[PDB]
Every structure is written in structure tokens, then in C-alpha cells.
Design a protein around this nucleic acid. Sequence first.
DNA 1: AAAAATGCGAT
DNA 2: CTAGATCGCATTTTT
DNA 3: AAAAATGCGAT
DNA 4: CTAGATCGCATTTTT
Lengths: 200, 200
Amino acid sequence: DPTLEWFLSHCHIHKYPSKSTLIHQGEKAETLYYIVKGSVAVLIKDEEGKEMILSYLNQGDFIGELGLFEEGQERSAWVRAKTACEVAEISYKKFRQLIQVNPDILMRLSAQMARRLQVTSEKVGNLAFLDVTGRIAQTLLNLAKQPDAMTHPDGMQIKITRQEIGQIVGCSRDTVGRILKMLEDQNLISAHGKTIVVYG
Amino acid sequence: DPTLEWFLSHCHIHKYPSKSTLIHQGEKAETLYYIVKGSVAVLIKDEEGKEMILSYLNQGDFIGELGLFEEGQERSAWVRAKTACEVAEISYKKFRQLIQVNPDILMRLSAQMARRLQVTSEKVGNLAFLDVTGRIAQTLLNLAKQPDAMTHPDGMQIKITRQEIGQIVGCSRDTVGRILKMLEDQNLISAHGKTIVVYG
DNA sequence: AAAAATGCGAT
DNA sequence: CTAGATCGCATTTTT
DNA sequence: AAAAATGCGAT
DNA sequence: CTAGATCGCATTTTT
Ligand SMILES: Nc1ncnc2c1ncn2[C@@H]1O[C@@H]2COP(=O)(O)O[C@H]2[C@H]1O
Ligand SMILES: Nc1ncnc2c1ncn2[C@@H]1O[C@@H]2COP(=O)(O)O[C@H]2[C@H]1O
Ligand SMILES: Nc1ncnc2c1ncn2[C@@H]1O[C@@H]2COP(=O)(O)O[C@H]2[C@H]1O
Ligand SMILES: Nc1ncnc2c1ncn2[C@@H]1O[C@@H]2COP(=O)(O)O[C@H]2[C@H]1O
């Protein structure tokens, strides 16, 4: 790709070890991010410390872009590295320049903001409509289709803690587990610890 | 404002009577909207017909913008008119042109997309964290602060059906009502039918 | 050992 | 009435 | 009347 | 155990 190559050339690159945190919530926003390599997680916490995963982002994804359109804006959430991470970085001020040079880039950002709004809205519906069993059953299906799923003679094999399934669908580790036994109880899946084979 | 005036001049205007529907969900997307006057509601329905209000939009708000960045895109939700409505309209194709003429407009769109993502994410958290009492108590507070709230010697007076409070916080008309009696039972509010005075 | 992540029944 | 959450108790895991 | 919107207890 | 939803029944509302 010609454009984004021109873009990066204008960004410093930084790497973050997995589990580290790239964007702090509440903190003043002035920089834009573009994940060159690695995946992360965007999450918001409750007063008590409880977390809720709003999304995962990957290669070719921008981050910290929500405060780019109105001075004195704060980070809307925490962004933690899921894996090692190589991330390009540029200042809004700097970035805004590029925009005026070539608009095509702002068009790339906006598209991601668009797709982002769809899925988050889809997420509002899920919490509003489906029950936790439904929400988990859907997450396993989705995860079983991502690139990090391994092949298995009976379907797909994923590996994830129950804590996270709780932090994705919005329930508690305790409910996830109970639900997980049922789904197996119904030969729908097979779980052993963090390993789950989604049959199909 | 100089820009948006240049914009409208390029859009046909259409009016929609209240309760009518401007954007059909699922339908192919090719047009952009900008509410010149009136307010609307963006909503998604469940398989059974049940509705969930993702948001309300007003004067100076764009609509149907999510399918503007990738050919063959479908409307992500229903958009129904809350009041009479005067709405400017333009085709993506046409709109994209303007972008290349002046980028500033795409910058206005994107900002709204940004703000939109914040609040929807804030909404995901609400459904995940707070209970229905908490979610309703917050809606009444918010609504009591909008421009259509009327002054009252004991606080603010809003007027809304319980069906809607159910469609905003994600509960059922029956739970809203029960919750509403409690909040009054606690001299927090005072409700008579569709009328509610939020004390304070 | 370290450092977390459970598990399931019970209320 | 049923789906979830929070505790009570007993055991198992990645850094 | 039209046309919806409830209300609350009960399970 | 508690918050919600779904039904059972009886009455009240904006077009
Ligand atoms: N309303 C909620 N109730 C319980 N857990 C929640 C809620 N919203 C988000 N969560 C989080 O999701 C997590 C799932 O696993 P845990 O039980 O370890 O901890 C849970 C909380 O941190
Ligand atoms: N719902 C969401 N979906 C995807 N990414 C999000 C969401 N909410 C926040 N983010 C990202 O997380 C970032 C947190 O800081 P910013 O608000 O600067 O920008 C935010 C977005 O890049
Ligand atoms: N999971 C849900 N359970 C119940 N009602 C819901 C849900 N999600 C959205 N709703 C809608 O919210 C509305 C609130 O008022 P009603 O009971 O008239 O009808 C309800 C449904 O149409
Ligand atoms: N969560 C949301 N918040 C605000 N507006 C939304 C949301 N989801 C959808 N919309 C608007 O509703 C429109 C429905 O059709 P489009 O997908 O073309 O574009 C969508 C947005 O303009």
C-alpha cells in the first residue's frame, strides 16, 4: 500500500511488551496510534476495578483516535497489549497536517471509526437482547473463527480463560464456567481449563 | 457557519412527519443525511420485534453515514422521526466529491462519528455494570437536562412513556413502572402517567 | 515456588 | 418462576 | 370511539 | 438470595 507507507514514515515506532498498557484512560489525549504488529484490547473498568472488553484491535488498526477532533479530550478507555506490540505513533497536530496534505488518510481513519460504531452497537443489542448463554455461545463461535484458532479433528480449538469470557460477554467467571459445563453437557463443546474445542 | 452552508446548498431537502421512518435497516446504503431541524431516534430491533434505542440525534447531526466508506454496505439500524423533520440529503458519490474539494467537511462527519463511539461505549458499560434502577435513574437525570424539559417548582418535568424508558435502558415496560413507583416511594421523583418531575 | 485462576454448591 | 451474582470452601495453574 | 399504553401481583 | 421477565387481569389514554 502506497498511502499508509507514506504515513508511517512520519511516525516514531515504539514497542510494548504483552500485558503492558499503551493508552491510559482519563488521561489527556494528543497522540494517534496505528498498530504495525500485535493485537491489543480496549477496555473500560467499573468503580470496583471490574473490566469490560469493548474490543480487540490488530495490525492496520488505529488507536487513540477519538480525541483527535476536539481540543482537551480525554482517553475514553484503557488499551492493554494482548501480545508483543510494534506500534506507530504520531501527534494529532502532526497528523492533522498530513490530512491537509492528503485527505485519503482521514478517510482510512473514519472507515475504521465507522466499522467500530457498527460492532459496538451490535454489542449494545447483544447485552440487551441475548442471555449470557447466547452471548458466550456467540463469542466462542467468533473466536473459533479468528486467525489464532488451531485446527482439531472435531472442530476448532481456542484457548482462553473464563475470566476473559466473563469480560467479553459481561458476566462473571463463575457464570461463564457454569455455562461452559452446560455447553459441553450438550456435546456442543469440550472444555478442559483454558482449552476449548468448539465442535462443528 | 460558512462550510455547512456550502454543504446544504448541494443537498435536496425533504421533510418527514413525526413517527415516520427515514432510514430502513438492512437496506442498501447510498445516501447521507444531515438533520436541519427536528429530532430522530436510531434503533435496532430484536427477532421478536422488540426495540432498543441506540441514540437520539438532532439539529446539525449527520445520519446514514456509516455506509459511506465501503461499497455495498447496509443500513445498520432503523431511524424514526421523533418530531416533524427537515432533513438535508446527498449521495455518497456526490458527498465524496465535496470531501475532495474541501476536507473540512469530512472532519465534521468524523467528529460526530467519534463522539458517537464514546457514548455507545459508555452505553455498553452501563448495561454491563449498573442495574436497571441505576440505568433508569441516569436516564431521568439526562432527560431532565435536555432542552425539552420544562421548569417546575420542585425540579424538572419531563414527559415520556414507560415503553420508551424500557427501550432506552434495556428493560421492560413492566420493570420501568415498578422502578418508577420505588423512586417516587423514595421521594426521588414523582410520576403520574407520562409525566415525571425529577426532584432537585 | 510464584502468581493467578478457578470450581461448584449454596443462598 | 428462572437467570445471575456473591460467598463459602477446596484445588490448580503461567511468570 | 380510536389506538395504545398500562398496572401490579403473581410465578 | 435478589433482580427481572412473563402472564394473569382490570383500566386508562393520544390519533
Ligand atoms: N455487571 C457485572 N457483573 C459482574 N462482572 C462484571 C460485570 N460487568 C463486567 N464484569 C467483569 O467481568 C468479569 C468476568 O470474570 P470475573 O468474575 O473474574 O470478573 C468480572 C468483572 O470484572
Ligand atoms: N468501542 C470501541 N471500539 C473500538 N475501539 C474503541 C472503543 N472505545 C474506545 N476505543 C479505542 O480506545 C481508545 C482509547 O483512547 P481514545 O479515546 O483516544 O481512543 C479510543 C479508541 O481508539
Ligand atoms: N432483553 C430485553 N428484554 C425485554 N425487553 C427488551 C429487551 N431488550 C429490549 N427490550 C425492549 O424494551 C422495551 C421496553 O418496554 P416494553 O416492555 O413495551 O418492550 C420492551 C422491548 O421491546
Ligand atoms: N450507536 C449509534 N449511535 C448513533 N447513531 C447511530 C448508531 N448506530 C447507528 N447510527 C446511525 O443510524 C444510521 C443507520 O444507517 P447507517 O448505517 O447508514 O448509519 C447509521 C448512523 O448514522
